Amino acid sequence: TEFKAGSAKKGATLFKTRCLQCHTVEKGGPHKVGPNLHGIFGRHSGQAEGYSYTDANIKKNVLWDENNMSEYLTNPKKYIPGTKMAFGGLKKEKDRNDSITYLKKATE
Ligand code: HEC
């Protein structure tokens, strides 16, 4: 791809410190500020039920792949103009590789 496997352990911790404040990953976990991310790969954006996404996330109709996800983690607002995900971005590809490495793992 344009994405290469990284550290699943490294990623778990990137997640704990940069994504847990607003999200859960497990099947049957709850929606918090952001949606629960279980099964997000291959899924399109704005489809978890019981969660109020913005008009923008929804209309972007993004098919979430390790690659797509990469772009998005760089600069969310950049990738999805008007999204309410208040996250700066992960500029370091290595960081993204790690994080996505875990998400790929944890969200199945
Ligand atoms: C709270 C300050 C958040 C942090 C930190 C992170 N995200 Fe988030 N995320 C949040 C919201 C409010 C939303 C919904 C946006 C909208 O416009 O409705 C999101 C959304 C996502 C998505 C898209 C979900 C989908 O289409 O189903 C992804 C893929 C996602 N968030 C991932 C993610 C990761 C991996 C994060 C850590 C680096 C992270 N987010 C931070 C809120 C917050």
Concatenated DSSP letters of the chain: -------HHHHHHHHHHHTTTT---STTPPP-SS---TT-TTPBTT-STT----HHHHHH--B--TTHHHHHHH-HHHHSTT----------HHHHHHHHHHHHHHT-
Angle at 10 between CA 87 and CA 80, to 5 degrees: 25
The resolution in angstroms reads 1.9
Q: Residue 105 corresponds to which tokens in the numbers above? A: 């793992």
Beta-strand runs (E) in 1-108? none
The CA-based dihedral angle spanning residues 60, 63, 64, 69, taken in that order and rounded to the nearest 10 degrees: -50
What lies within 8 Å, CB to CB, of 26 at 6+ separation is 36, 38, 106
Q: From the CA of 50, how far away is ligand 1's center (Å)?
A: 15
Q: Which residues pair with 44 in a beta bridge?
A: 63
* Amino acid at residue number 83: T
> Which residues 6+ apart lie within 8 Å of 20 measured at CB?
none
CA 1–ligand 1 middle distance (angstroms): 23
CATH, residue 16: 1.10.760.10
Q: How many other CB atoms are there within 10 angstroms of residue 38's CB atom? A: 16
Q: Are 38 and 29 in contact (CB under 8 A)?
A: yes
Cβ of residue 35 lying under 6 Å from some atom of ligand 1: yes
Residue 22 Cβ inside 6 Å of ligand 1? The answer reads yes
Among 85, 90, 100, the mutation site with the greatest number of ligand 1 atoms within 8 A of its Cβ is: 85
Method of determination is: X-ray
Q: Is 69 annotated as a binding residue?
A: no
CA distance 12 to 79: 23
Q: Residue 51 — left, alpha, or beta (φ > 0 → left; ψ -120 to 50 → alpha)?
A: beta
Q: Please tell me the distance from the alpha carbon of residue 95 to that of residue 44, in angstroms, as a whole number.
A: 23
**Bridge partner list, 63:** 44
58's enclosing H/E stretch is helix 55-60
List the structure tokens of 101. 């490495």
Q: Provide the residue range defining the domain that includes 80.
A: 1-108
* The total number of structural domains that make up the chain: 1
DSSP letter assigned to residue 48: S
Atom of ligand 1 nearest to the CA of 57: 17
